[PDB]
């Protein structure tokens, strides 16, 4: 419903999401 989480909290998950995305593309290519 209403806002609850901070900028740093969302950001840390987004940054990890991005890192995993990039890592997944490297391994997918290794093929």
């Amino acid at each position: 419903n209403r806002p609850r989480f901070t900028l740093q909290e969302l950001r840390d998950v987004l940054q990890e999401r991005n890192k995993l995305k990039s890592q997944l593309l490297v391994v997918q290519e290794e093929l």
Binding site: L7, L10, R11, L14, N18, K21, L25
Partner: protein
């Protein structure tokens, strides 16, 4: 692999079609459901130009103001930027000036820019004629296209034209 890596950025008001334009470019598909972007996302597509392999890393920003700090972080690396409005939403067209100001504040002065008037399939709700988009782009000295993620109009053309223009400037240096 590739010869060049081009970092691209899509900016514009929430709801104008940035994610759907990118979905058409990367998957050649369209869906009418609105899933607003949480902060930022990116997609990769590699193309061939004049004998070179060009990896396009395309960052898709959230348009809502609450994501400003998150999206500001991606202007600095950008080599080309699509400024997107919705031809059925004059307010989103007026806000292109604000998005341009943000580019000038945070991006390189030599960044390639292009304006996309999206949703050109929805003429039954059009609020901005194409001539107004052309004139805005002309005044900024940049290119303009009306696009449709839904009808597959000018999406491929927009990205290939932007990449060609980046490659041409780079090659001359």
């Amino acid at each position: 692999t590739y010869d060049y890596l081009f970092k691209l950025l899509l900016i514009g008001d929430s709801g104008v079609g940035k994610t759907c334009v990118l979905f058409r470019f990367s998957e050649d598909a369209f869906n009418s459901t609105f899933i607003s972007t949480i902060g930022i996302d990116f997609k990769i597509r590699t193309i061939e130009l004049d004998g070179k392999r060009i990896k396009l890393q395309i960052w898709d920003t959230a348009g809502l103001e609450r994501f400003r700090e998150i999206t500001t972080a991606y202007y600095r690396g950008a080599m080309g930027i699509m400024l997107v409005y919705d031809i059925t939403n004059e307010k989103s067209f007026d806000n292109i000036r604000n998005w341009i100001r943000n580019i000038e504040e945070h991006a390189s002065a030599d960044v390639e820019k292009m304006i996309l008037g999206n949703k050109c399939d929805v003429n039954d709700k059009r609020q901005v004629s194409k001539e107004r988009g052309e004139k805005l782009a002309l005044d900024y000295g940049i290119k303009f296209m009306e696009t449709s993620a839904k009808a597959n109009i000018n999406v491929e053309n927009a990205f290939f034209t932007l990449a060609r223009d980046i490659k041409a400037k780079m090659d001359k240096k």
